[PDB]
């Protein structure tokens, strides 16, 4: 039958979908959500054998264990056990596009388990097996007899085993197919793996059972009153003595309870549902649920007899909240939401796509600690525990159907085909049937990148029809089709339009007011975080706050999809596309998260935390105005700390309790501050600290901050006349300056400072030379490749222009003696193909104080692509342990990504001045720096810098970070100017014009001293 | 795998649905819709063997013919060949409700056919087999190898046989299952049959082929300009030299043509459809399509190479028309429609559910000749030829998905279940993919009586998405759910609300204005035509014409679903539910059409024709105002004939040409009419006649008529004084009156006229007595049964009150002699259980002229259910050939169904005074009669009457018409008053209050004499 090559067959003998069940036989156990003896886990050690195709599986395997089989842990993806390679491809399908057929060579995983079944489970009732996740299709056998078939790797498939089990030892045999017609609907941009990767369990239900139940909550105009409506359905023989009691609890307090026999209201000419009943409970002043305050109630559903004998109980956490779109705004409990979200794939560097609670909690904590309040399940239903955690910790969730056909041409070839409507419908309907009672789910998504077909319109309407409590969204076909309640584009820019034919990405501000448009706009994906990215992130948030209908978006994405591989010495290193022999592959494109795979934060995470702050600030005189962006909570766990420092030197500080109502303001008057003595700039820094620990954070957690320049006193003091005068020694080949124990050497043919001595010790390993290029960031590269060059990408424009090959040609090199100093004047021209790209003119002034004043004036040809940077660089001979600087920090920051960094005196070990991006590139820069200290050296001015043991050259020629080797000494890059990093998307130039170095003429000055 | 017990498996290896293909290899042939050598019919003689279950089918049958098999004609329903019994059940499923399972005893029909295939068909291209209709599921094998599986009994299932055929002889084996999970979606109220009941054919297509094409027509504001857009899709190898040419023709004139290589516009981030192309053709002043004027163009789709080599051609008839709902009105080409429709099941008395062209054409002609302009495909996609005929003849069609789950509890149990969405979606989507190019289809329906489920909303939106050119309707769940663009109730009444819980049937006038309602209202079903029905039909039409948003409805229904059986002598008779041993069954409920199964009209058909007329008339003095209800055509084939007659006697007539624009008016002044001599009522009768023949009618066809009472001159002259005086003879037992050769005998014990003599010949077989009951009509009975009595049904109320068992108690009987006559006075009381139901007081005045004047005054207890009638009856000893009368006719007519009848002098053979309803009941009544002549008798007055060889008692005690036996003499029923027949529905009392005999006291008078 080859059911895995037929979209008309997505399952065989599979039981109906339903909300989480545990079949408690004790009401209190159900109320407290404790372990149920009726729900057994079958996770653990299983038997496994890999075959190249289903035709290769021996028939004997159905009856008994295969000798060649190994014992492995389940859940798991068999690629993580080394049976075959995981494949990383983005858009292009991993198999020949020939629906509904798949390769004859179809990796087949044969799982088997011998386990015990208690007679009490077969004595009566129903015993079913639940596979929460099998990738991508499978056939099931029990004790040698075929049971069923199932597809959709992201939703549970359940089968009744009652008639297949025997008391005692039993054996399950599961044949998992890597490829199936289901694979055509699972083209998500991620590692393509397979196997039983989610829990497997046995559930015992009585014959007369609760087969389904829906919980709804409607409110009055001010939410001061509510009605909890619970529809319950049963299976088994109907009896007049049967009853259903639904009770609501808040902690150990029973808020409400209602009982009724089965039999619903009349629905049509044939009557009503005799096997269903709806209970309605009134609730006064309900504690409302939100990401701000995740208030939860517990609903317990008991199926029992009139005399009071319990048959079974099921239950769920209830969050009282209303989600609705009105007058173009997405409202939660009547207030307009501002979505601080992120897309999160289920990925672990060691276990692949197998999720555990520890990792889920870790992700949620990091998200909330970084001011995120929402997550999108990109791009499939998540492990069931995820929703429980979001309900309790408090996060808004977009639950998304497991439907993505990105590799099709056109993208809607399958979704507009009625023959694929059945398969698609099951992926949407079974997701709704499973997750509809979770309060954290506030929006349903029809899937991802599948164009827009008639099947989308049909399923959109199906959802609106079965569950009007949640809006439905879908981005395919242009982000504003008839299949979405929310304009949800991916990578639409703030002010710039991208008028692509058929599916343009309008500026989000412009999109809102297009003729006839009235819907809210929330980006399903934005701020692509590939490596050194998130440039311009602040521009998005400024717009979200100014425009009511711009209600946020979900960053792409949370975690790098890197996997762990081991080298000869057994040491671990992060691998990406192609590192497993997988081909075709999309290499490093699987890594664009805010955090590394092990959950260590990328510098970009702090920029996100800062822009997503819930408190806004304004300064006027001695007054600080604090505004709360919270919609429901008062600031009952916040105190404001303030500090005033002169060039990093503290002068005053204090703390005031914050008491701001949601949406309110608080004025804080700062004490009269005494005017400082010494020259310098005064800086005011404020931060919001949470004194008390919470379920998601520790005491002392900093949730927001902001800085302001206060008074500044320019230095007018004249330095005392030097004690000594620098001496100039002119030779045919060099201009040497000597002062005390220091020496400076300028080569007259190259025109650069080739060496500096402190005593008899050389300070440089490479001369100080101008630098106009940077090791390309992911954003600079785009999709450009050797095999397929994208001449539009920044890196390609720089290469073609000769930026990376330009050679300095000396135009001038003179030496002059001044009253109290020596002056060296130079002029260089960088050319390529007889084309002058840049011209650098400098003066080096060394005085009796021993300080070297460097003035740099650069000219950049108007017709050459704007340079990545304009600075100087050199390899210092020494290696020091610490780096001290007065500027923006402490973390890496760039021109278009420096709002989170603060101006102050920072000191960190050298290693922290380098960011370990898996794919090496320019990194570790710090901007707005007025003073830098390293070893005996000090540089002063107004510059940007990065310092590390890796040259730009090595970073550019190395593909993986674990292949980098510390070079001799220390490479120093001091830029007068540096180009933005961009990030709106990672396949086209995204650096905004205001951050491009297009001025034509640039000037900067530095002072190098000891 | 028992695929027939799994709604998840509706097919296996079935090819995609698509518009009708023929794969012409010559363009001229495609243009003229001539037979294609590439489309072969496999209809004819097949081998067939019946089995009680699929498990009983021998494996040898796959490889070779079963010697036990018979040779039968295909298409056919095997029940019609007598292999097993056809079952008639309405709502209750014919199988135990246990979805998705069916009985293990599952009638299985094994069809096989040995046929030839030329090597030319196999050397190149693709050869597919096409099964237009298989009931209800089947597996297919070719030369012993399994090919595929398919469900949905009303749409074609196609399979690629290229890899299974060989040059020369080949054998197909088809195992058809009577029951399958598909049966759960096929609970339509009709005979449950099975088999390969629609055509089977073989189609050869080149490897590089046209796999689909959609035709659409858009217009400018005044419809003076249009654009034809044709999206063409191909399968096979794409080549730059491939081309598609779409040409449009109007007869032999080419209107437009366009050519283009494949490659559609950019659709999304991945590009566009390289395998598709859309051609756009401009058409100036297009001839618009409508039921009034079915103008059609022909679109020819040619797949060819750049060098000009034709690969293959497809085509379809194109009707330029726009269908849209705006401001609450359904518009066709910008004009508001008035749906004169009827529901039509595919039924044939001999062939069961197998349709043939002749029967289809016959139905269409009868429909248009009786002023119907629309048909609803109740309740499944029809035989493909149906749409072609509707396109060409001109009828608006509601195409309906094969989905009905009426028997479920609640009705939406399956339609609200997501697990059944797949199965339901295929029934809707494959219907749209097949019929979307037919101009006759103006509305899509999601099915029938399946409640309202989420699956309906999903499919409703799918259709709106894929085809915005047509509105979508569905009646389930209340007729006004979110799954319908049209309020389409079934049996909602005109003024009376029926507030049922959850699914109320509001008065249609009230429904339109409910708070927030804005949609048009068109009844998907109304005017249940069970037997003697359609009472109150005029009330719907008056409402349809006065309310803009009440745009008509579809009568239920076209034809009686009776089947032919043969008695011991080989004589054929009409059978219904239960006559085949089928049980449970819903007996005669399968017969509620406007025409008998053989297409003979029921009397009600003429009432429908009259009320659905396209011309309205008004009279003022000598001026007749003719208003046209046509929306597009001028009256270019109509002339008005007028006639003025005095009590049936023609005094003047003439004819005037009709020249009225659509929606226009024409004034016609009648010539100065000369005053008649004698007394009486002058009547004006006008009729619209079509001088020229049309595609649907013969020359002289009458399309409309109307009558008016003109001047009346009351007779004020007295009759000349008679010569003789009647003689009275009193005996203890009788009062005998004698005059010349006439004699009247009144029995003093009974109080009734027991006998009359003309010469020495007795005139009566049964005394002349009062009658207050009638043989119950279908509407009087409702759903009442002896095993399940419905106390609310009229028949039950009459029975319980004792109307049928009441005995006459003589209260008075006296004789008086007058100067010129004898006067007999009587009074009777009809009682039951000591209850006096009725009291009849009469006087008989026999004068010298031989005339007997009967004056009758009746009292009806206000607390007894209103009587079916109030009159007299008797069995005349004579049997005459003709029946002549001055009154309403010529056809059967009742109080609430007599608008179509005309007042005049009619003369028909006695036989035509009896209506052969399959289920016997009161029938043949003619109302407003002032004079009745039969044999030597003449009756005068103002009454209603029926006359036949069947007593009311026999009609009421006989179940089938073929069991009736002519009684001695002739039964005469003369009523002063008669209750309406009703018909708004047939399961609850539907006779309007104004047509119920509730006056309490009634009076009428008759004069009996010798003609
Ligand atoms: Mg499949
Ligand atoms: Mg994608
Ligand atoms: Mg700031
Ligand atoms: Mg099936
Ligand atoms: Mg042969
Ligand atoms: Mg029905
Ligand atoms: Mg009339
Ligand atoms: Na906003
Ligand atoms: Na990526
Ligand atoms: Na506080
Ligand atoms: Na690199
Ligand atoms: Na109307
Ligand atoms: Na019927
Ligand atoms: Na005319
Ligand atoms: Na009868």
PDB file of C-alpha atoms in Angstrom, chain A residues 647-809:
ATOM      1  CA  UNK A 647      34.127  60.367  33.358  1.00  0.00           C
ATOM      2  CA  UNK A 648      33.337  57.148  35.221  1.00  0.00           C
ATOM      3  CA  UNK A 649      34.160  58.607  38.630  1.00  0.00           C
ATOM      4  CA  UNK A 650      31.169  58.371  41.024  1.00  0.00           C
ATOM      5  CA  UNK A 651      30.143  61.652  42.649  1.00  0.00           C
ATOM      6  CA  UNK A 652      26.634  60.911  43.873  1.00  0.00           C
ATOM      7  CA  UNK A 653      23.959  58.245  43.910  1.00  0.00           C
ATOM      8  CA  UNK A 654      20.794  57.109  45.622  1.00  0.00           C
ATOM      9  CA  UNK A 655      17.678  54.997  45.302  1.00  0.00           C
ATOM     10  CA  UNK A 656      13.961  55.680  45.270  1.00  0.00           C
ATOM     11  CA  UNK A 657      11.100  53.195  45.506  1.00  0.00           C
ATOM     12  CA  UNK A 658       9.069  52.948  42.301  1.00  0.00           C
ATOM     13  CA  UNK A 659       5.300  53.147  42.696  1.00  0.00           C
ATOM     14  CA  UNK A 660       3.837  53.525  39.231  1.00  0.00           C
ATOM     15  CA  UNK A 661       0.441  52.205  38.172  1.00  0.00           C
ATOM     16  CA  UNK A 662       0.126  50.402  34.824  1.00  0.00           C
ATOM     17  CA  UNK A 663       0.353  53.072  32.099  1.00  0.00           C
ATOM     18  CA  UNK A 664       1.037  55.677  34.777  1.00  0.00           C
ATOM     19  CA  UNK A 665       3.932  58.004  35.529  1.00  0.00           C
ATOM     20  CA  UNK A 666       6.049  58.909  38.553  1.00  0.00           C
ATOM     21  CA  UNK A 667       8.165  62.034  38.997  1.00  0.00           C
ATOM     22  CA  UNK A 668      11.440  61.681  40.859  1.00  0.00           C
ATOM     23  CA  UNK A 669      13.333  64.764  41.975  1.00  0.00           C
ATOM     24  CA  UNK A 670      17.090  64.319  42.231  1.00  0.00           C
ATOM     25  CA  UNK A 671      18.856  66.035  45.153  1.00  0.00           C
ATOM     26  CA  UNK A 672      20.793  69.186  44.268  1.00  0.00           C
ATOM     27  CA  UNK A 673      24.080  67.891  42.869  1.00  0.00           C
ATOM     28  CA  UNK A 674      27.297  69.800  43.693  1.00  0.00           C
ATOM     29  CA  UNK A 675      29.132  71.036  40.595  1.00  0.00           C
ATOM     30  CA  UNK A 676      32.298  68.931  40.201  1.00  0.00           C
ATOM     31  CA  UNK A 677      35.758  70.490  40.222  1.00  0.00           C
ATOM     32  CA  UNK A 678      37.809  68.836  37.480  1.00  0.00           C
ATOM     33  CA  UNK A 679      36.869  69.132  33.818  1.00  0.00           C
ATOM     34  CA  UNK A 680      34.883  66.363  32.168  1.00  0.00           C
ATOM     35  CA  UNK A 681      31.390  65.168  31.292  1.00  0.00           C
ATOM     36  CA  UNK A 682      28.814  64.294  33.944  1.00  0.00           C
ATOM     37  CA  UNK A 683      26.721  61.207  33.221  1.00  0.00           C
ATOM     38  CA  UNK A 684      23.477  60.175  34.865  1.00  0.00           C
ATOM     39  CA  UNK A 685      22.653  56.477  34.886  1.00  0.00           C
ATOM     40  CA  UNK A 686      19.443  55.039  36.276  1.00  0.00           C
ATOM     41  CA  UNK A 687      18.443  51.404  36.586  1.00  0.00           C
ATOM     42  CA  UNK A 688      15.373  49.561  37.779  1.00  0.00           C
ATOM     43  CA  UNK A 689      16.135  46.771  40.215  1.00  0.00           C
ATOM     44  CA  UNK A 690      13.740  44.112  41.509  1.00  0.00           C
ATOM     45  CA  UNK A 691      14.525  43.713  45.249  1.00  0.00           C
ATOM     46  CA  UNK A 692      12.685  40.420  45.552  1.00  0.00           C
ATOM     47  CA  UNK A 693      13.171  37.134  43.745  1.00  0.00           C
ATOM     48  CA  UNK A 694      10.357  35.924  41.482  1.00  0.00           C
ATOM     49  CA  UNK A 695       9.493  32.633  39.807  1.00  0.00           C
ATOM     50  CA  UNK A 696      11.694  33.732  36.900  1.00  0.00           C
ATOM     51  CA  UNK A 697      14.398  35.938  38.442  1.00  0.00           C
ATOM     52  CA  UNK A 698      16.728  36.409  41.405  1.00  0.00           C
ATOM     53  CA  UNK A 699      16.704  39.252  43.906  1.00  0.00           C
ATOM     54  CA  UNK A 700      18.626  42.187  42.475  1.00  0.00           C
ATOM     55  CA  UNK A 701      17.575  41.521  38.868  1.00  0.00           C
ATOM     56  CA  UNK A 702      18.039  44.631  36.693  1.00  0.00           C
ATOM     57  CA  UNK A 703      15.044  45.093  34.389  1.00  0.00           C
ATOM     58  CA  UNK A 704      15.771  48.476  32.792  1.00  0.00           C
ATOM     59  CA  UNK A 705      18.270  51.311  32.504  1.00  0.00           C
ATOM     60  CA  UNK A 706      18.979  54.608  30.763  1.00  0.00           C
ATOM     61  CA  UNK A 707      21.675  57.289  30.584  1.00  0.00           C
ATOM     62  CA  UNK A 708      21.833  61.037  29.975  1.00  0.00           C
ATOM     63  CA  UNK A 709      24.694  63.459  29.575  1.00  0.00           C
ATOM     64  CA  UNK A 710      24.350  66.135  32.259  1.00  0.00           C
ATOM     65  CA  UNK A 711      26.619  69.173  32.647  1.00  0.00           C
ATOM     66  CA  UNK A 712      29.996  69.190  30.896  1.00  0.00           C
ATOM     67  CA  UNK A 713      33.034  71.307  31.698  1.00  0.00           C
ATOM     68  CA  UNK A 714      35.563  71.518  28.877  1.00  0.00           C
ATOM     69  CA  UNK A 715      39.203  71.496  29.941  1.00  0.00           C
ATOM     70  CA  UNK A 716      40.940  74.803  29.304  1.00  0.00           C
ATOM     71  CA  UNK A 717      43.972  74.097  31.489  1.00  0.00           C
ATOM     72  CA  UNK A 718      47.372  74.444  29.835  1.00  0.00           C
ATOM     73  CA  UNK A 719      49.897  71.633  30.409  1.00  0.00           C
ATOM     74  CA  UNK A 720      53.166  72.685  32.070  1.00  0.00           C
ATOM     75  CA  UNK A 721      56.065  73.256  29.664  1.00  0.00           C
ATOM     76  CA  UNK A 722      57.773  69.925  28.978  1.00  0.00           C
ATOM     77  CA  UNK A 723      61.019  69.137  30.780  1.00  0.00           C
ATOM     78  CA  UNK A 724      62.662  67.669  27.674  1.00  0.00           C
ATOM     79  CA  UNK A 725      62.425  68.098  23.894  1.00  0.00           C
ATOM     80  CA  UNK A 726      62.073  65.139  21.482  1.00  0.00           C
ATOM     81  CA  UNK A 727      65.043  64.575  19.186  1.00  0.00           C
ATOM     82  CA  UNK A 728      64.779  63.823  15.463  1.00  0.00           C
ATOM     83  CA  UNK A 729      67.309  61.594  13.696  1.00  0.00           C
ATOM     84  CA  UNK A 730      67.014  61.597   9.911  1.00  0.00           C
ATOM     85  CA  UNK A 731      68.466  58.793   7.793  1.00  0.00           C
ATOM     86  CA  UNK A 732      67.899  57.837   4.159  1.00  0.00           C
ATOM     87  CA  UNK A 733      65.489  55.110   5.258  1.00  0.00           C
ATOM     88  CA  UNK A 734      63.979  56.473   8.485  1.00  0.00           C
ATOM     89  CA  UNK A 735      62.820  59.345  10.678  1.00  0.00           C
ATOM     90  CA  UNK A 736      63.575  58.414  14.286  1.00  0.00           C
ATOM     91  CA  UNK A 737      62.329  60.314  17.302  1.00  0.00           C
ATOM     92  CA  UNK A 738      63.870  59.771  20.719  1.00  0.00           C
ATOM     93  CA  UNK A 739      62.609  61.053  24.055  1.00  0.00           C
ATOM     94  CA  UNK A 740      63.927  59.701  27.314  1.00  0.00           C
ATOM     95  CA  UNK A 741      63.439  55.946  27.352  1.00  0.00           C
ATOM     96  CA  UNK A 742      61.179  55.875  24.272  1.00  0.00           C
ATOM     97  CA  UNK A 743      61.853  55.636  20.536  1.00  0.00           C
ATOM     98  CA  UNK A 744      59.648  56.012  17.467  1.00  0.00           C
ATOM     99  CA  UNK A 745      60.606  54.871  13.975  1.00  0.00           C
ATOM    100  CA  UNK A 746      58.880  55.956  10.773  1.00  0.00           C
ATOM    101  CA  UNK A 747      59.934  54.166   7.559  1.00  0.00           C
ATOM    102  CA  UNK A 748      60.402  56.772   4.807  1.00  0.00           C
ATOM    103  CA  UNK A 749      59.521  54.424   1.946  1.00  0.00           C
ATOM    104  CA  UNK A 750      56.351  52.982   3.483  1.00  0.00           C
ATOM    105  CA  UNK A 751      55.428  56.151   5.363  1.00  0.00           C
ATOM    106  CA  UNK A 752      54.186  54.292   8.443  1.00  0.00           C
ATOM    107  CA  UNK A 753      55.177  53.986  12.087  1.00  0.00           C
ATOM    108  CA  UNK A 754      57.020  50.685  11.772  1.00  0.00           C
ATOM    109  CA  UNK A 755      58.319  50.369  15.332  1.00  0.00           C
ATOM    110  CA  UNK A 756      58.129  51.893  18.806  1.00  0.00           C
ATOM    111  CA  UNK A 757      60.508  51.075  21.666  1.00  0.00           C
ATOM    112  CA  UNK A 758      60.091  51.345  25.424  1.00  0.00           C
ATOM    113  CA  UNK A 759      63.658  50.956  26.602  1.00  0.00           C
ATOM    114  CA  UNK A 760      65.135  48.214  24.438  1.00  0.00           C
ATOM    115  CA  UNK A 761      61.776  46.488  23.967  1.00  0.00           C
ATOM    116  CA  UNK A 762      59.889  46.578  20.668  1.00  0.00           C
ATOM    117  CA  UNK A 763      56.170  47.363  21.037  1.00  0.00           C
ATOM    118  CA  UNK A 764      54.920  46.399  17.576  1.00  0.00           C
ATOM    119  CA  UNK A 765      54.966  43.228  15.470  1.00  0.00           C
ATOM    120  CA  UNK A 766      53.291  44.946  12.517  1.00  0.00           C
ATOM    121  CA  UNK A 767      53.447  48.651  11.524  1.00  0.00           C
ATOM    122  CA  UNK A 768      50.561  51.009  12.323  1.00  0.00           C
ATOM    123  CA  UNK A 769      48.595  51.278   9.068  1.00  0.00           C
ATOM    124  CA  UNK A 770      45.229  52.583   7.871  1.00  0.00           C
ATOM    125  CA  UNK A 771      42.484  49.977   7.605  1.00  0.00           C
ATOM    126  CA  UNK A 772      39.273  50.337   5.585  1.00  0.00           C
ATOM    127  CA  UNK A 773      37.930  46.783   5.672  1.00  0.00           C
ATOM    128  CA  UNK A 774      36.550  44.293   8.177  1.00  0.00           C
ATOM    129  CA  UNK A 775      36.233  40.518   8.274  1.00  0.00           C
ATOM    130  CA  UNK A 776      32.739  40.212   6.745  1.00  0.00           C
ATOM    131  CA  UNK A 777      29.784  39.711   9.092  1.00  0.00           C
ATOM    132  CA  UNK A 778      26.952  37.364   8.049  1.00  0.00           C
ATOM    133  CA  UNK A 779      24.982  40.469   7.058  1.00  0.00           C
ATOM    134  CA  UNK A 780      27.850  41.661   4.848  1.00  0.00           C
ATOM    135  CA  UNK A 781      27.905  38.277   3.081  1.00  0.00           C
ATOM    136  CA  UNK A 782      24.215  37.570   2.541  1.00  0.00           C
ATOM    137  CA  UNK A 783      23.694  34.544   0.296  1.00  0.00           C
ATOM    138  CA  UNK A 784      26.800  35.220  -1.795  1.00  0.00           C
ATOM    139  CA  UNK A 785      28.955  32.173  -2.631  1.00  0.00           C
ATOM    140  CA  UNK A 786      31.878  31.253  -4.875  1.00  0.00           C
ATOM    141  CA  UNK A 787      29.540  29.085  -6.960  1.00  0.00           C
ATOM    142  CA  UNK A 788      26.855  31.771  -6.811  1.00  0.00           C
ATOM    143  CA  UNK A 789      28.081  35.314  -6.248  1.00  0.00           C
ATOM    144  CA  UNK A 790      25.551  37.956  -5.233  1.00  0.00           C
ATOM    145  CA  UNK A 791      27.177  41.115  -6.646  1.00  0.00           C
ATOM    146  CA  UNK A 792      24.782  43.171  -4.522  1.00  0.00           C
ATOM    147  CA  UNK A 793      26.073  41.974  -1.139  1.00  0.00           C
ATOM    148  CA  UNK A 794      28.376  44.373   0.719  1.00  0.00           C
ATOM    149  CA  UNK A 795      31.278  41.924   0.820  1.00  0.00           C
ATOM    150  CA  UNK A 796      31.001  41.388  -2.943  1.00  0.00           C
ATOM    151  CA  UNK A 797      30.864  45.124  -3.568  1.00  0.00           C
ATOM    152  CA  UNK A 798      33.949  45.613  -1.395  1.00  0.00           C
ATOM    153  CA  UNK A 799      35.864  42.800  -3.116  1.00  0.00           C
ATOM    154  CA  UNK A 800      35.042  43.948  -6.654  1.00  0.00           C
ATOM    155  CA  UNK A 801      36.038  47.505  -5.758  1.00  0.00           C
ATOM    156  CA  UNK A 802      39.415  46.217  -4.613  1.00  0.00           C
ATOM    157  CA  UNK A 803      38.969  47.209  -0.955  1.00  0.00           C
ATOM    158  CA  UNK A 804      40.573  43.973   0.258  1.00  0.00           C
ATOM    159  CA  UNK A 805      43.414  44.206  -2.259  1.00  0.00           C
ATOM    160  CA  UNK A 806      44.179  47.934  -2.264  1.00  0.00           C
ATOM    161  CA  UNK A 807      47.845  48.747  -1.676  1.00  0.00           C
ATOM    162  CA  UNK A 808      49.106  51.877   0.041  1.00  0.00           C
ATOM    163  CA  UNK A 809      51.166  54.108  -2.251  1.00  0.00           C
TER     164      UNK A 809
END
